[PDB]
Symmetry: D2
Subunit: 463 residues, 4 copies
């Protein structure tokens, strides 16, 4: 009998195995990676603590890691993003997973802690992270442990106080110097996403980052496919499943026109919305305008749009006074980060009426309502199924190569994968979708000053 | 004390009511119709038997009819299109409904018959039909009642055998002349969809149509919105929910480029597929080409597309030989009619592996597999939630007007036993009811400009011939 | 030894012939019509007076008609739409053609009259028309001719004054009963466009239409291809050649969301504009909103848009008061009809500065300026080359069949459209060139949906 | 009588002046730079040699440079790209320009020579280059100079034996050592385009770069706007004007899916073509596939496509083998560089029939034909008017600021003989200068938000490695 998991319903494993099988066919990067490195066992001896959305696509990553030799513990990095049948399938395969769709904030953090008590004793020795929560627990616990503890009493939001409480409990409960023990053994962290990657650079900049980091996010085959086309597919999926609204004839507002805002704007415009965009970056604003989006402030958009999406990575994008101005039954959601793009906390003393999981109606004192999706957390993973498998194969092939890099083939800074590996990720996905790549003849290669086998662009190229 | 319904779980009534409320906001035509005709109760005394997908949108239509005075009994017109919280909410309102997502074919036809056993006794006096099943139940039983029973005594499909078995049962279990009783009481039928309306015209053409009919499908504000923009939103919704597959990068094939096929190809193109189309009609073919779609035969597309959608209203579109030639894990689905656009019957010797409701993996002798959605029945309603509310407001406002026309505006017998469409002024009225909700500001003709183009300021703005 | 033509530069004939050759490859339907009916000579004995934009595409139509046996005289139906090399090539082939890019309204009407003095004597016996001007001349002279002359003293625009002056002239120069003679000789008219078909239906409904007519515009394979895709390709072509502005990032306003408005909005949207639309028709307005266009009034748009396009066929769409509100150097143009969708007349006392042909900058007293294309006439024909040949093959195959119907093939003095099987046939004639492979119904399947295997496939009310 | 210009016609100056005035309104970035820097005269003493298409847009740049203090000499960097009326207006402004649409290759290089004889003797001190021709002139002459000359006697193309026999003539005709004189006085070069800049990078890498250089092509507000959106607007413009062909229904083939190829595919797809794409870079191939383009080889496309566009910057993309396999009257054109993307030389003995300027019909032994635009040279500038003004305003505001950096802000010598880019804050400023004209309203970061994402409120908002 296996005891060391927490999932909604183990019986869901066969359903999860079915969808994993279908996903494998859609993830050639991952499957080709298994066949290349399976034989070579480059992660043999890895103990990978994984904190990343426990979806069907992540199950395929997990078993890739396990096929490369890795020993695994896993949690979701979001309280609503777990796909319970994926988690059930992993648990039934003997991998400790602690992931429930709709976990509480306290459970979310307790489970993250569980990643570091390895089965058979000891710590992890690699972190695979999305949004940086597992890395942040290690760093906060290490800093409290070095003696700097007043910060844990700093008042904050609810989640922030749960986190401080968790660090206090681990310090009270684990042996002296537990966090230093973990920090010592972690050989590297690979980070999936823009927000978490920004945290890593700020810590590398303060000299406060405890082990090397590979920025998986800014592989070109991650940032310009997952963040862009992922969201182009999965944002409108989230909105439709949450609300079933007609998008043709609607006005949508997207805050942010980075990779996620571009894909989000595109998702809504392809689905038939007339899209407006806000930006603080004049180059990205000019991109939006050249794509035919009206570029406006949120104050301008607030009374006009039918649908609002935050896509910034920033905080306080849609505020109480915007929502006060919205039309009755405007739809509001977040595809960027955490839950602070929208001022969710300032809504908690209005009447919330739950419609169904991750769909709520919020009523203002003047009787106008808004429809809030996933309580302001990632809408594509919360209200639907996240990005489809194929584009996740790109991102997760990057993740697997990043773990191989950090556990085998780096100083205490933040690195990207070499461009020939990035190009390799692309190559692995072309045959599945029928691309026939041309090859430079040698004189054509020489003419533009590249090798026939690449890299084809300088490190500065932006695609 | 109410037990005259059959639904999956009456406990989903509260969830259903919440989505119904959300849908009212998205259905201005239906709600304005309640406001305008509510106080006039134009449907008082009406007994409307509805056979139309039991969705949240249909629930708003049903409550609009009752707001106008109608007594109602309802069933879904597909075994997989019921939205069980919508059914629950209607049954909890006291309205007889017999609608379950995943009902069997035998259950399906028995529920249709239950439409005609009015509560308190008697029959309906109106039919609101989608796809013509309730209308066909009356006409077939009437024909058999007349002594022309030959056709029952062997069918052609399984459903044709269940269906004829029903007719036989009703001839024995219902009183003598019951189908003539019904046909006598029915004052009209309004019919929702292309396939069902074609049946009506053929029956009218042969002089077998037993009561006046309004073709709601071919209102402009139905066929060029519902069939076109409805499918554009709901086709990939259903493919996404069933498979979670990445559409960008994939080749899709759509059979048909009528209104549904146009909306279905846009759905897949707008989602990022490279879309090819088949057609038999040279005009529709050339439209597909001019919109940038490659126009090929199914035989051409069979070995190369990732996704197949039938959208023809015809049969035998995707055959066993096509599916044999398909790449492994190709997705096959139908958004047109019945379940014989795809030869589903030809697959029933193969290993089916159920993935989840309405998603099956079918494995061929050569180990090649295909992914079948909703067993070949309407994918948008079976795998997702059908069209969204706002465009169904247009369809269903037309339905309501048509019900008013045949029930309350036929004292002079303006509607004979033929198939009619609503007048243009009503069709424009449907459009006008939906403009303010989406922020459209309409221009008003100046008097001079109105005279200049030969129209009244209040419309109608186009000849009856105009194709939009 | 011909001089029965008027063209700007007959030395452009070789160049027109080269582009005619190129267009023939692009016009499968016209060419297959030549091939199929040529040996039938169904137009032998026809004398076709054509009034239709003298473009390269129209040259291929004219030579198709001649190849089916027609005798021909031709003019352009718009003063800026002639392509001078196409006119030179038709003149050089020996066919009377009176068409110059930039002809004046006075010349325009003098040339239309030249249609009716048939070479070798007599009158024409068919009319192929676009916008109805040749038809209108016959009807006006015929009405005045039998006595009601008073309307000729009441012109309501300067073009009407020129047209009425022409009628007076003819009635005095030409033999008595001349218009009654023409009217008797005309066996039919086929009419290209929405506006001209508007004119026929109202003459028919009033019982003043003098001969039978075929509404070619409302072939499916015309209105839902030419009016729609044609404008989609050629509206932005005209705006780019006249202004060379960047379209990405600009706001455009299209008045009307009929077929032309639909195509025009798509032209500007596809080019990169954020497009707003006006409509009086709630159904067309709802279509626009559902295709993602903001549907506003002209008054809402006037201070906002960078580009304005009238596509209504109505009058007084863009007024002096709208133009006074426009931002400086807004671009204004018409793709609908005549020049009364924009109040061009009202700008006649502002300072006009010609930039180049069909491009003018108009200064208001407050010094704000607007860019006017083609003096508010058809911008795709005025500033560029009209629709491209392939879509025009569809319209002109319909023209050619309508000429055959009325001349060789029952037709009362009403307005008729071609039978659906001919409409389908037009579409078939264009599939192989663009690589379409049509599916053939099995008898099985045809029987199931209620059609003959060979069509037609749709009821006559089907809207496509 | 100022005598020093070579144009097609001086009498076109007024028409050029009318369109320059129109273009200023469309070029808020250049005008803003004029107003802000005019008073500061940051380029008094500058003597800029410019080699860059003599278009209406270039004329506004030239006058901008002139307004900031510059003495100027100009040539076009393509034989067909000159807009004769712009040239005439510049000449009439008193500026030495030598540019004719349809100049010879021998005149082109002799004009490029006329650049370095500064009026009143002496040399330029600034090079503003598109393609690096005037740059390589200095460099190929300088190398020639103190030693190596064996490369001059080794041709390549016809435009390379002409280029070498020109280098021969200056060595001969100028004072001995004059190429060193020029490389001496040149404070810097700014380079407009991808092909030019890589040649700068190949040379700074070799240690043979003779003066500082700003890579203007890789400000974000050039490469991601001009290369992309410029070709999206002007590719189909060139093709329409050259051929008047219907694009809806046609298949187009685009070699390359860098910035120009992305722009080019979009231009054709938005105009109604079904677009196929070739690539050698697996990442750009994957981007095309994800945008819905079929990605194939040129051998696959050659018999299929109606329209071919080269967009690679590389040579031998379309060879005699491909063109032999094309369908009759296929359209072939190039928007990348030079005229060696298409093997034009392989057509040199076939029948060419000139349709009109920059449009030729080429007939093969088998009587099949292709239509070649601008003889294989840049189709958007040869057959139409190049990129529109608004997007050249972004490129040319970068050019202007690059000329200010190398001439005015190099006193500390912060620019050595390497290839630099402008600072991101200046790149951001170019973008800001174009927002108000197109009605963009920018949001302002509050300080806590700026801290949160790790940026100053005033920018730069992205890291130097960010890809947009
Ligand atoms: N839901 C998903 O599946 C998914 C996928 C990828 C990335 N992400 C997340 O999305 C967020 C954004 O990622 P990205 O890759 O687009 O980052 P990015 O840096 O590429 O883009 C962020 C944009 O936000 C803009 N911005 C910042 N503050 C703004 C404000 N107040 N108003 C308007 N715009 C503002 C910035 O100018 C920037 O251009 C992050 O939280 C990231 O981790 C989510
Ligand atoms: N799923 C939905 O929500 C929804 C919505 C509206 C209508 N419908 C149904 O969808 C079907 C189609 O409706 P429509 O309004 O588009 O009708 P239509 O008459 O407008 O279009 C059907 C098209 O299929 C083409 N066709 C017929 N046989 C073909 C074949 N063997 N191969 C390829 N093409 C063929 C026809 O030429 C025709 O253009 C009908 O059964 C209708 O009832 C479904
Ligand atoms: N330039 C071309 O090549 C070209 C091609 C085809 C037709 N046309 C012409 O274009 C005009 C329109 O043709 P159509 O086929 O689209 O006709 P249509 O009947 O299909 O469309 C006209 C539309 O204008 C709308 N309208 C009328 N007055 C309006 C107003 N004041 N404000 C806003 N909308 C108004 C109508 O409601 C209608 O939908 C006609 O003059 C026709 O002859 C030109
Ligand atoms: N006409 C214009 O207005 C204009 C504007 C900007 C740039 N350009 C020119 O266009 C060319 C391309 O510029 P860019 O910015 O796109 O550079 P880029 O580096 O961004 O893109 C070029 C692409 O071509 C691909 N490639 C190279 N050889 C190939 C082959 N044999 N087959 C298929 N793909 C191949 C490369 O992989 C690369 O992705 C350059 O010559 C540049 O100077 C022209
Ligand atoms: Na997914
Ligand atoms: Na729905
Ligand atoms: Na043309
Ligand atoms: Na230009």
């Amino acid at each position: 009998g296996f005891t060391d998991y927490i999932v909604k319903d183990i019986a869901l494993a066969d359903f999860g195995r079915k969808e994993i099988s279908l996903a494998e066919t859609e993830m050639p990067g991952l499957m080709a990676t298994r066949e290349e490195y399976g034989p070579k066992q480059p992660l043999k001896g890895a103990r990978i603590a994984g904190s990343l959305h426990m979806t069907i696509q992540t199950a395929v990553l997990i078993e890739t890691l396990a096929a490369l030799g890795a020993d695994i513990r896993w949690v979701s990095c979001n309280i609503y993003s777990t796909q319970d049948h994926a988690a059930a399938a992993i648990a039934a395969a003997g991998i400790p997973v602690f992931a429930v769709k709709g976990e509480t904030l306290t459970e979310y953090w307790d489970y993250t802690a569980k990643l570091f008590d390895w089965h058979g004793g000891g710590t992890p020795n690699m972190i695979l992270d999305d949004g940086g929560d597992a890395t942040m627990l290690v760093h906060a616990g290490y800093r409290a442990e070095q003696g700097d503890t007043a910060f844990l009493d700093k008042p904050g939001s609810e989640e922030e106080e749960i986190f401080y409480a968790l660090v206090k409990r681990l310090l009270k409960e684990k042996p002296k110097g537990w966090f230093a023990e973990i920090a010592k053994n972690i050989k590297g962290v690979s980070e999936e996403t823009t927000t978490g990657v920004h945290r890593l650079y700020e810590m590398a900049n303060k000299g406060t980052l405890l082990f090397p980091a590979i920025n998986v996010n800014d592989s070109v085959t991650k940032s310009k496919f997952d963040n862009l086309y992922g969201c182009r597919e999965s944002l409108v999926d989230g909105i439709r499943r949450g609300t079933d609204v007609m998008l043709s004839g609607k006005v949508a507002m997207v805050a942010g026109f980075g990779d996620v805002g571009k894909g989000s704007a595109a998702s809504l415009r392809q689905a038939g919305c007339r899209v407006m965009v806000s930006e603080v970056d004049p180059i990205c604003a000019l991109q939006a305008a050249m794509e035919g989006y009206e570029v406006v402030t949120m104050e301008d958009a607030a009374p006009r749009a039918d649908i609002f999406v935050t896509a910034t990575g920033n905080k306080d994008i849609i505020t109480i006074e915007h929502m006060r101005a919205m039309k009755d039954r405007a739809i509001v959601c977040n595809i960027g980060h955490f839950d602070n793009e929208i001022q969710i906390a300032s809504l908690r003393n209005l009447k919330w009426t739950n419609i169904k999981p991750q769909v709520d109606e919020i009523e203002f004192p003047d009787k106008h309502r808004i429809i809030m999706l996933s309580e302001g957390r990632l809408v594509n993973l919360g209200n639907a199924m996240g990005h489809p498998s194929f584009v996740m194969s790109a991102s997760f092939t990057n993740q697997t190569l990043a773990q191989i890099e950090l556990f085998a083939n780096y100083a205490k800074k933040v690195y990207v994968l070499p461009k020939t590996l990035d190009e390799k990720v692309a190559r692995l996905h072309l045959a599945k979708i029928g691309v026939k790549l041309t090859e430079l003849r040698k004189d054509q290669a020489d003419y533009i000053g590249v090798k026939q086998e690449g890299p084809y662009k300088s490190d500065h190229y932006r695609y």
